[PDB]
Symmetry: D3
Subunit: 133 residues, 6 copies
């Protein structure tokens, strides 16, 4: 059919603010299924830098890494019809009410969640967090 | 500009236990229930009539099969700008914040139907609530 | 031990926009809707019959007046241990966690009615859904 | 980045018991309460100053009467880009996902007020919290 | 009728954990109305000690005061039928799911909310937080 | 005061999409996730060890098959009095306010498992997280 898989990361601020179930629930209610899930008490900076390698040239690149390893994170692989962009739309941004970041986040860096933005990004990101491909 | 529109809560809503969730979103936008019917299984006739305008489409038959594969609730809602607002509340599976935007993810199994114009509203209401 | 019980959603539920909230609590406990009717204003006859056992009480007349001062929904729910469980779900205005425990605060305006025994269930269902 | 904006929870919010619901959406977006006051009935001169930029509109008088028809809560929220962000949260009755889009459906009884600019924010805050 | 007024205090841990609306919403949904409300960025230890004067002899008395002034608090006066005990039952304790403390709290001291436990306590507590009686 | 207990989110939880709902109730009670694992299908020997104290019961085999009929999540929660508190949160299908009381209605498909003692907690955690 139109089956797809995408990679989501629940960020440290999510645990800090007790919004983990809240975020996962929004994705769950949109009818997406967990295919793989891993809890990281503290992720290796290595994986983070690979995950954000495309951003290695930006000014915010190192502070973002500091943050991404400042607390726990959960890497999840969701599956569903048109999953990559639907979950991306669900993630939204801090300016659009109705989405996860729009309702719960308010910072350029501490935005609670990451979602693959394309097929190439997904395949690559999933490989990073679930090497046992 | 007070109006009345027709809403159908689809089988997938019962399957996934989202009936109250959906009705609650409409109720909280302050629209009232004027009439309502519960159908364990809707008569295929009614369904075909409801989607008459689609009889020529390729998705017609399967859609009917689905619309009868479970219970459905027919509801007539009243309120200011009801048709337009409930339609907007229904949304689509792309934009978060709406019923379909937050809970649906299929082009066919989209939980709810809402009239899209004054004309279809009057017609749809007559189909499910002939007693008028 | 599959059963069917009758539930009435009272006027105060429509007044306070808690209809979906209440139906959602029952739906989430996994009980299904077997039949349902919406009444803009319930016929006083039905109400008097429903509360027959109370005809001698001092609160009878006022209760009837209230039960007809707004819309009400009659619902027949099915499920394992339905009568007992939905009754427990209905609770009372003292114990938090139940429908009345979290949302009601009056001895008369308590949002919902649920049969309390196998006998009253069969009788109550016959009153609102004679077509049996 | 830090800003402070003034929000007013309107009479209809108390009537419909949506006060916690509204304040909750702002709290979940991570904004903090700096100041807050509950008015069982706000002094009319305060309301008129608050809407002074509207003093020549046809709806001015009626709106002020509505704002004085019940309690209201004035709150000073602090947070990054607070003015713009809380303004978008409020939205309008045509935008699902926002406060007015999900819970309001009237041109006047629209549950909430939020400053629309830095000047209006500064002016409005001094109106409800002159003690600074 | 059976009209009553009671005094509720939203505690510092409530703001810390962003549970203020949540708590007030549970009381709001049970059909109780706010008659007076005051926001304290930091309450004067004086009022706290008066509020808990009956506990002045307990070991936990000073730490509880330290906490009660460690952050903001909101004093509210609710009104409704049988308000004092109904709101008291709503408050519940950390061992009873279904109540505010039962669902959201988990400590002997940081328990999110205070509710008058009797008519005498209410009248006295209300006087403490709303002297303009 | 600090304890650590083992929780299992059962297959029915994924089937009924109640995973976030269940985990949310534990998260809102202030318990923290220490360890967590998702199993699309848990190895049967793990389930049998987990319920080894039940190995002689008539329901043993059927329960194990149910526990292997879908994904499950094993979590180690840490918090003050975690074992007892999370146990009460789980409750039973007769107790409104708890997880099973609000969402479950079966003797076997009861959505969640939580250690009932310090020894069982210690044993259970080593079964799902032997890497310690
Ligand atoms: C733009 C930006 C991003 N970041 C971090 C957090 C962002 O989620 C991450 C990726 O940036 P980006 O791709 O711009 O946003 P999204 O995550 O919405 O695609 O980099 C900052 O820390 N500061 C910034 O200014
Ligand atoms: C377009 C389309 C519709 N349908 C069914 C389900 C749609 O809800 C129903 C009506 O279609 P439509 O009128 O295009 O959308 P809405 O219901 O948003 O106005 O027809 C399909 O089964 N497959 C399709 O490709
Ligand atoms: C006891 C009582 C009941 N009533 C009305 C509303 C009650 O829901 C209805 C039925 O009473 P009852 O059977 O005692 O309670 P339940 O509905 O919990 O079984 O009668 C009053 O109006 N005043 C009263 O004092
Ligand atoms: C435009 C308009 C506003 N009002 C009232 C309610 C509006 O919230 C208030 C302020 O007007 P306005 O600034 O247009 O709306 P907002 O509050 O979205 O900026 O005036 C009316 O009563 N009638 C009207 O036609
Ligand atoms: C019993 C106790 C109370 N306290 C503080 C917080 C309690 O909410 C407050 C009042 O105690 P108490 O009357 O026992 O509980 P409640 O507040 O449920 O009536 O004193 C402690 O700090 N430690 C304790 O051991
Ligand atoms: C008692 C019982 C349990 N079970 C299954 C589901 C129970 O959750 C599991 C463990 O039994 P038990 O310890 O009695 O329940 P809990 O999980 O509340 O401690 O065994 C059955 O399938 N049939 C039964 O009759
Ligand atoms: Mg990106
Ligand atoms: Mg259409
Ligand atoms: Mg009775
Ligand atoms: Mg304005
Ligand atoms: Mg006390
Ligand atoms: Mg057990």
């Amino acid at each position: 059919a139109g089956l797809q898989r995408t990679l989501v990361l629940i960020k440290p601020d999510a645990f800090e603010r007790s919004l983990v179930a809240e975020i996962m629930g929004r994705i769950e209610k949109k009818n997406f299924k967990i295919v793989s899930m891993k809890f990281w008490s503290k992720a290796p900076r290595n994986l983070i830098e690979q995950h954000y390698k495309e951003h290695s040239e930006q000014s915010y690149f190192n502070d973002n890494c500091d943050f991404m390893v400042s607390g726990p994170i959960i890497s999840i692989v969701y599956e569903g019809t048109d999953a990559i962009s639907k979950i991306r739309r669900l993630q939204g941004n801090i300016l659009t009410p109705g989405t996860i970041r729009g309702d719960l986040a308010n910072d350029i860096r501490e935005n609670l969640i990451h979602a693959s933005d394309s097929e190439d990004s997904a395949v690559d990101e999933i490989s990073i967090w679930f090497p046992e491909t």
